[PDB]
Amino acid sequence: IIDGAPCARGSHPWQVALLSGNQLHCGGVLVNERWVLTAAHCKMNEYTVHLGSDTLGDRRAQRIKASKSFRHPGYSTQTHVNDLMLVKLNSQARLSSMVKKVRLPSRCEPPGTTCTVSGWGTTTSPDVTFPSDLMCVDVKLISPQDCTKVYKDLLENSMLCAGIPDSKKNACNGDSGGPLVCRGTLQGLVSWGTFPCGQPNDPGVYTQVCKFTKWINDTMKKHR
Numbered sequence: 722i723i724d725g726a727p728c729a730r731g732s733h734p735w736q737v738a739l740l741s742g743n744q745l746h747c748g749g750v751l752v753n754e755r756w757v758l759t760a761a762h763c764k765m766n767e768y769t770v771h772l773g774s775d776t777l778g779d780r781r782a783q784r785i786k787a788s789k790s791f792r793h794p795g796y797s798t799q800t801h802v803n804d805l806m807l808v809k810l811n812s813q814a815r816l817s818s819m820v821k822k823v824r825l826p827s828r829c830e831p832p833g834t835t836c837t838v839s840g841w842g843t844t845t846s847p848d849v850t851f852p853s854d855l856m857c858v859d860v861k862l863i864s865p866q867d868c869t870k871v872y873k874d875l876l877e878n879s880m881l882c883a884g885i886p887d888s889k890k891n892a893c894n895g896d897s898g899g900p901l902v903c904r905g906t907l908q909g910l911v912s913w914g915t916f917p918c919g920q921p922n923d924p925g926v927y928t929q930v931c932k933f934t935k936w937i938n939d940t941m942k943k944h945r
C-alpha cells in the first residue's frame with residue numbers, strides 16, 4: 722500500500738493473507754468459515770492463510786492451510802480478465818471479533834464513491850519495504866470511460882478502477898487479491914496496475930466483485 726497508514730486496529734476482520742512458507746504471497750478476504758476470495762493470479766498448489774490480526778506474524782493469529790483453490794473458469798493469464806479465485810480452507814476458521822465474514826455486495830457502487838484498500842504489500846516502489854502492520858489507503862472509484870483513457874484496450878467492464886487525482890495512493894506488490902471496500906461491502910479485489918506503484922494518474926485496477934456474486938455463491942455451494 723502506497724502513501725497510506727496502518728489500518729485502524731480491528732476494522733478489517735475479514736482481511737486475510739496468503740503465505741507461502743512464512744512469506745507473503747497475496748491478500749484476500751474471508752467470505753465465510755470455509756472460504757477465501759482472492760485473485761486468480763495468486764494461484765498456488767497449497768496455501769497458508771493468515772487470519773485474525775492486522776499484524777503479520779502475530780502469536781494471536783490463526784493460520785489455516787488450504788489445499789484446494791478454484792479460479793474463475795473465464796480467467797485469462799494473458800489479459801487477467803476475470804481475476805478471481807476461491808480458496809477452500811482445510812478446516813473452518815473460528816470466527817471472533819477479529820475474524821469476520823466480508824459483507825458481499827448486492828450492488829455495484831458508482832463512480833466517485835470513497836473506498837478503502839488494505840494490504841501488507843510493499844509500502845514502496847520500485848525498492849521494496851514490507852510491513853507487518855496492515856496498511857490502508859482511501860481511494861475513489863473512477864468511472865469506466867475515465868479509466869479507459871489511461872488503460873485503453875486492457876480494460877474489461879468487469880474490472881473496476883480506483884485512485885485519487887494526482888495521487889500516489891494505491892496498492893502495490895503483495896497487496897494482490899486483497900479487498901477494496903466501499904460503503905461496507907466488498908467492491909474490489911486488487912488485480913493490476915502500473916509499475917512502479919504509485920505513479921500519479923495511473924489508477925489501480927480491481928476485479929469488480931459486484932459482477933461475480935453468482936459465480937461466487939454457486940462455487941461455494943458446488944464444493945460443499
Ligand SMILES: COc1ccc(Cl)cc1C[C@@H]1CN/C(=N\N(C)C)CN(CC(=O)Nc2cccc(S(C)(=O)=O)c2)C1=O
Nearest residue numbers: 745746762892893894895896897912913914915916925926
Ligand atoms: C506494479 O504492481 C502493481 C501496480 C498496481 C496495483 Cl493496483 C497493484 C500492483 C501489485 C501487483 C498486481 N498485479 C500483478 N500481476 N498482474 C496479474 C499483472 C502482480 N502482483 C503480484 C506480486 O508481485 N506479488 C508479490 C508478493 C510478494 C512479494 C513480491 S516481490 C518479489 O515483488 O517483492 C511480489 C502484484 O502484487
Ligand SMILES: [Cl-]
Nearest residue numbers: 790791792793
Ligand atoms: Cl483451477
Ligand SMILES: [Cl-]
Nearest residue numbers: 811812813814
Ligand atoms: Cl472442520
